[PDB]
Amino acid sequence: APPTLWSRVTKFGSGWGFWVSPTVFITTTHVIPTSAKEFFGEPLTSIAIHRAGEFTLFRFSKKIRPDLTGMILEEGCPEGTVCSVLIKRDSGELLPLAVRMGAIASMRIQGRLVHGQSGMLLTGANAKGMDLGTIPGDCGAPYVYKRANDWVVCGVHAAATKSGNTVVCAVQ
Amino acid sequence: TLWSRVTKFGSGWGFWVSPTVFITTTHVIPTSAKEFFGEPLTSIAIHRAGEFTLFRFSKKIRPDLTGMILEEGCPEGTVCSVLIKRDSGELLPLAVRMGAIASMRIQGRLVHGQSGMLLTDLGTIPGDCGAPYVYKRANDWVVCGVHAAATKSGNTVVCAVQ
Amino acid sequence: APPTLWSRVTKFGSGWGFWVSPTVFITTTHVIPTSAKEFFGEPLTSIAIHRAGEFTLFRFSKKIRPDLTGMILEEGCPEGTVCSVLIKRDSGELLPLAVRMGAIASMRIQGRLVHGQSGMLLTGANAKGMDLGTIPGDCGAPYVYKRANDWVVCGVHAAATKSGNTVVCAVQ
Amino acid sequence: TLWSRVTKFGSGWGFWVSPTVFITTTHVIPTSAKEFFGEPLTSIAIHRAGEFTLFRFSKKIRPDLTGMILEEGCPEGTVCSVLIKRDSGELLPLAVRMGAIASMRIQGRLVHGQSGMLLTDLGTIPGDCGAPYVYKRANDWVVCGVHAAATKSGNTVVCAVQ
């Protein structure tokens, strides 16, 4: 994935979020600290917060990231799309995990009911654990893909099954 | 052969697990009937669980067959074959990589079962409901559910399970 | 596959062959009986026989199959093409086995050295034996695919590994 | 991690199987050298078999590692991961379904090893030679060869084997 996409992936709460534009940041709802009253030096009163289940969007009054251009955010993607999940791991390593996307689904995964777009990893038969699959610390990582000359962001990492083969992207 | 067990039934198909046990997709079963396979309903134990239905006959309908293993779905990552018959005489064993159990929105409608993706004519069509999902485990064939639903595109399918 | 393709698949020697046109029949070399001096009621002297290893083409002086139109025969297909192998089995059943095609290869398969286009079956993990894979009696069955509005024939079945997962198409 | 074993070497990469054993693709190895990893060649046992090369050091170069299982290819149908590193810091574990051992014509040239097809950025590039092919078997990781060649398209790859 391009360096400009990796620059938008930001360590946040118990996981990650992603800058869509200078004023719009998206994440997975459960990584946000429940007591938090201040984000990027701005009080809640100066932020419009739009929560749809495990999808959260923050729209700031001030340009927080003026180095960035606005890109396209869509509500999931067509069945069969191959996305990359933009995962940062311990030591400047960058893991763009390949995932074939499927239908919108409701599942029970460990102690949680989750709803979003399902997908199947294309990294191995080999996805139980950190080397070729996801870990709980990856929540909030963006799902991206290239369409003609444009990159699209279409959701944030919300959950993975015990085997690691199935993942769920929370969508706007 | 496995293929001899795949039988035309209602608006689709079903599968003989043994001489006495037949499995199908619930929505393909006729809603007006007094017998199946020549046996009165009173001689049949019918077990419905959402889109999965099992029939257990009092007499041997298919005595030519041996019993095989029936399980509730299969591990994620298993590559199943869906044993699709067409009225042309074509046999289409389609490869599907299986995923999680889930409630899925498949052309507007909520279907509960095991998700799968095709590895690929080369896809399912509506008249294919009830076809069995099978795989080879060591020396033994396993049947693990019945074809319930597919999206417009044909990447995503749903195996209804016991 | 269309009924017109199945009509061209013909029981022949120890396997199968395929009518490309009214005058051209293709097969796998090893299914032809070694003593044979007559084919479709025509003597050898009235047939042009072109053998390239496990690929054999017969061009007849008379129209043997005037019910048929000539179709396109090519020398294998691009890597990544999904072909159907047109296999007839015991009882009017028709098995168009799906195969993802790969590189031209030289292999040792059981007691034979074989050369042709390799492919991997898409019927299962499940291809050891007759139900979802090939058997020795399938040799000579055609490899076909659709390109825009045309069907193409691109070789004949020559061999399969012990697991059943890899097959070899003999090519012109 | 498995990834810490993947090391830049020559015109590509190699892999530490244990503190003393390093595997790579033969064509990536320098042809002008008096040492590797600080050890004189006289202190190194070099075993070449076509496009597969194994180095066995007299001293522990990577004492932080445990030995893992090295095998001569893998069964057909195994889904391997190729552990590709890029100089950007990207880690690209690519899924490949493995096929037969064969001599294959790969961009004009004959390469002997185990064929594979990608299940899919999303493919290999020339600087990737020497990356290991791995898979999980029960509880144990297995390495079964090194990346030797790929076609222009990226469907077909060749794993060089011991």
Residue numbers in the entry:
A (entry chain A), C (entry chain A): 1 to 172
B (entry chain B), D (entry chain B): 4 to 123, 131 to 172
How does the study describe this entry?
Viral replication requires a 3C-like cysteine protease (3CLpro) which processes the 200 kDa viral polyprotein into six functional proteins. The 3C-like protease (3CLpro) was named because of its similarity to the picornavirus 3C protease. It is a cysteine protease which shows a typical chymotrypsin-like fold containing two domains: a β-barrel domain and a β-sheet domain separated by a groove where the active site is located. The active site is characterised by a catalytic dyad (Cys139-His30) or triad (Cys139-His30-Glu54) and shows a strong preference for a –D/E-F/Y-X-L-Q-G-P- (X can be H, Q, or E) sequence corresponding to the subsites S5-S4-S3-S2-S1-S1′-S2′. The key role of norovirus 3CLpro in the processing of the polyprotein and the absence of homologues in the human host make it an excellent target for antiviral drug discovery.
